[PDB]
């Protein structure tokens, strides 16, 4: 068969969670299918990202991609808290990673202050160029920092 980007060991762990023993052929087939599904999701997400005139991928694009494909939505990935991973050691050269999560009291969450409100949307204007020359005003980039052919 082809070379797989998805390691069959993840499929093996998933099977172990369900008390199932797999041979090599179904393992490889499942890995290939998972790889194809990941590719499909990435294609859809990039389509949605390009539709919005952007180059930054957000969780909203992935959610829309999952919605167009008739996949059950995933919840809880829009949090503003940082993402930290722990590190366990099953043995020499076999590390494991888990999400860091500590129990908290309700007082700390309910009593916490709210984030700062950003300012309202507005627009300004200025002259980017007059008769083909860029004025040196604060609103334009400095001459210190690809704009002229040299062939």
């Amino acid at each position: 068969g082809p070379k797989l980007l998805w390691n069959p060991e993840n499929v093996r762990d998933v099977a172990d969670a369900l008390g199932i023993t797999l041979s090599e052929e179904p393992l490889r087939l499942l890995a290939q299918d998972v790889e194809y599904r990941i590719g499909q999701v990435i294609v859809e997400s990039l389509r949605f990202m390009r539709a919005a005139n952007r180059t930054t991928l957000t969780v909203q694009d992935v959610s829309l991609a999952l919605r167009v494909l008739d996949v059950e939505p995933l919840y809880g990935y829009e949090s503003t808290r940082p993402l930290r991973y722990g590190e366990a050691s099953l043995g020499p050269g076999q590390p494991l990673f888990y999400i860091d999560d500590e129990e908290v009291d309700f007082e700390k969450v309910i009593n916490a202050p709210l984030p700062k409100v950003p300012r309202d949307m507005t627009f300004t204007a200025h002259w980017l160029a007059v008769e083909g020359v860029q004025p040196s005003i604060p609103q334009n980039p400095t001459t210190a920092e690809d704009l002229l052919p040299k062939g």
Partner: protein, 184 residues
């Protein structure tokens, strides 16, 4: 205006604050009995003064999501929980946002449906088409599709919290009596 990012005031938000306060006090008494620990009241913070151009809602996702999370945490503490895992709280907040948007979209779907031919007295007056849902039907369908009813909402907002408060007060009285008798 001030108070925009805090819960309104009514007979329902009150009696909920009261139930939570009663729970905290009785938990303090239980801790004392067990010893034979301490907490502080919930306070909702507000935002600094804000200005908006023209007339429209304040579109700030982070602050709104934080306030919704605060409300969800208050409800889940009212349900009987004491500690939480952050991921579960985030999950339930996302679910709540999705449910709200689904409800509003259902209302909009029903309000702007295609018209139907007029008949009877409506046709006699010369009208050709009439709305296929009356204003009452639109709201009733919006509530029904999402699993709600007038009677259920009325009962929840009028009786459940009061009954829980009475039960909590009785439990507090019994606990106070037991502690006093144990001390004697």
């Amino acid at each position: 205006p001030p108070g925009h990012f805090t819960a309104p005031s009514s007979r329902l938000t009150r009696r909920i604050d009261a139930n939570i306060r009663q729970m905290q006090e009785t938990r303090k008494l239980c801790s004392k009995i067990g010893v034979i620990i301490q907490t502080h009241p919930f306070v909702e913070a507000d935002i600094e003064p804000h200005y908006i151009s023209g007339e429209g809602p304040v579109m700030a996702g982070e602050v709104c999501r934080s306030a919704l999370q605060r409300s969800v945490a208050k409800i889940f503490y009212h349900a009987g929980f004491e500690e939480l895992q952050p991921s579960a709280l985030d999950c339930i907040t996302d679910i709540a946002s999705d449910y709200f948007q689904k409800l509003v979209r259902t209302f909009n779907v029903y309000r702007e449906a295609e018209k139907k031919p007029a008949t009877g007295a409506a046709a006699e007056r010369g009208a050709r088409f009439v709305p296929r849902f009356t204003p009452e039907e639109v709201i009733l369908h919006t509530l029904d599709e999402n699993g709600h009813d007038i009677d259920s909402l009325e009962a929840y907002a009028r009786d459940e919290v009061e009954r829980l408060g009475n039960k909590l007060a009785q439990i507090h009285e019994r606990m106070k009596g037991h502690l006093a008798d144990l001390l004697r």
